[PDB]
Amino acid sequence: QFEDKWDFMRPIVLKLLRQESVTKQQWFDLFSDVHAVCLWDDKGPAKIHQALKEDILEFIKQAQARVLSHQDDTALLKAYIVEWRKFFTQCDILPKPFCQLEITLNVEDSIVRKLMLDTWNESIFSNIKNRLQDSAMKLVHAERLGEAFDSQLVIGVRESYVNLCSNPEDKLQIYRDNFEKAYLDSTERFYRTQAPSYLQQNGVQNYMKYADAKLKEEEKRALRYLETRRECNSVEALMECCVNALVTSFKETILAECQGMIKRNETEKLHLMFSLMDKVPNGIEPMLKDLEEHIISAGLADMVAAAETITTDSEKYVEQLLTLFNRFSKLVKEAFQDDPRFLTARDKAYKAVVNDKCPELLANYCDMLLRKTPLSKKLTSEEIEAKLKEVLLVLKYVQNKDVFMRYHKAHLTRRLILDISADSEIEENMVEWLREVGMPADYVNKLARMFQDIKVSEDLNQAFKEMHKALPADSVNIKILNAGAWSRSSEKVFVSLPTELEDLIPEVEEFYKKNHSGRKLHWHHLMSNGIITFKNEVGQYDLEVTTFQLAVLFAWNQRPREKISFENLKLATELPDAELRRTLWSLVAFPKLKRQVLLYEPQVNSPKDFTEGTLFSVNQEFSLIKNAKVQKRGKINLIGRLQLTTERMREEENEGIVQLRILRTQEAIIQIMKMRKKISNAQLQTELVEILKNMFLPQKKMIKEQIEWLIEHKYIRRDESDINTFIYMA
Amino acid sequence: DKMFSLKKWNAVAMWSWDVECDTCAICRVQVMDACLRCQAENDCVVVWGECNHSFHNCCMSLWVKQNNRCPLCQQDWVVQRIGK
Ligand SMILES: [Zn+2]
Ligand SMILES: [Zn+2]
Ligand SMILES: [Zn+2]
Structure with a gap:
């Protein structure tokens, strides 16, 4: 029975419990006798645990004294660890001589081991415990203060917490519930105190740096003081706690810094913030907002202001839009680490910038770049294209793409009629460029056709x-x-x-x-022009004039000194007052000339100033002037704006667009109804918006009108039970 | 050797289909006047085809529903311009 075997077992058991030199013979004397106890004595398994409890306790109490006596918290832990190591060692050794016990009552689930761990707790680790923890935490605090105590003291304590709760049901019960808990109590307490002490005098960025540094240090402490044996998971939560307690709390001010850094494109400072605030569950998301806001605001500010100063200055319009795009693109790439959320915030915000709304101006501007303007003359063909290449972005964002293209094409048409492009290739580039935007082939193809037509x-x-x-x-x-x-x-x-x-x-x-x-x-x-040699008393000068001007000038081919009235010229040329006046004005008042082609009695400031009785004659003193000297020959242009795009043409194009939108909408409805024989207004309108999306945004009013038309013309019909549902008809 | 002796002339003209600026062809009212539907149920405006043929937008739209080709020749139809 137990009382027959235990007397031989104990001595050995004690040696196991005291980590003494248990011999192989003793290993087996005990092992054999352990079996005999459990087998021979029905209560053996319990008695052996009881006797063990007593033998264990004796050791544990010795250990307690060996630790407890050390009123010095660090000496205490050193002793704790020492005793712990011996203790733990026996925890893993003892089950071996006692396999038979553990099998009858698996060395991994070892009941004795459990009793040992429990006894340790009962006498030491659930009581001097209070000091074990206070000490460990004082040490963790020391590591945080800068007093980098030998990490092992706290690590040791943590190892104990973990091993004590090694019970497979919850291997981290004590560790997590008490160590991590305490860790955080000390972490948050430490930093809830110090993180403010820091910022109190330090700038926000300084703190942020410190904060992140603290977090990195905490990760190290997590690897040390906290557990690494397994995924842990809660360990991440502890890092989240550090963030929340410290960083998120401080986030309330850090976001103000965000806005400032965005305004100054302080990508490095904001970069730090991105990372730090990304850790903050509710930091980085406000940063997305801030970015969006600044970009839109820039549109409403920088873009709009530019547009007003621009008028015709295409370079500035283009570059301002693109400057903003790139300024903020860079910001996101750096400050916001090329994060899709910020890229999106930017994308949306910029889209607004672009639509903050007149693609018709953008078209005028592209024309200025494409054609041989004073503006374009300052640019290398490559620079002209490059500016446009960047403009691709703007147009992709522009909703009403058809507007841009309508006006662009209108300009192209003219450019090709007059051959006033910057060069030939830039035109070809522009067509391909529109394709690169992803613009509607209808317009792009037509532009291409304009070139083919010139060929023919x-x-x-x-x-x-x-x-x-x-x-x-x-x-x-x-x-x-x-x-x-x-x-x-x-x-x-x-x-x-x-x-x-x-x-x-x-x-x-x-x-x-x-x-x-x-x-x-x-x-x-009207679009025709030519060159005439202007014979004067002072010489012969070619004139680059409109056909209308040629007709005006014709009046004096054989009689330069005869006066021809405005009306007589009108008749000679068979012109309307409007055009006649414009062409005459140039002939008697073209800019930059020191000599006008025609002389006249009353003078004009502008075309409207001419009267029917205004007499014109040939300026026989006309000459190309160089250094204020009269040249014997030369050449002067008197066309200028006479053949260049007026509010009239602008509006004509505007309505043309409106009508195209109407026509395409109507056709789109028909196409949709053919596809789906019966659909709701919502379905119809949705599909219409999508189909026409790459040109413009369809308005429900327009769509309605087209629907009514199509109903009236038997293409579609309303559902007998729902005026919003349409059915294909005919 | 006259006062304005012609040296160069950059002439510009367009072309369209000859016959007469008459009727619409599908319908038949003057291309510049109302069409079968407007002038009766009273904006009948003009539309061009890449083939340079012109009709009232309202007449050529109705026709295109039977077949997408030009009423006069028989080439695939494609709107060139809606502007007047
Ligand atoms: Zn009509
Ligand atoms: Zn045709
Ligand atoms: Zn017609």
């Missing part, structure tokens, strides 16, 4: 340059264009031409008809 027109031109030998063929360049596209309007300001031209046109028409049967010319003299 020039084939014809060449024929005339070779055949007409009124003038020396070659001298004339005739562009016969596709009216359906090039005749942007029905504005055909017919003008009576010089004999040299009037006697040519019949041949142009003749030849044209002989090769273009079924076709009809539209003599768009």
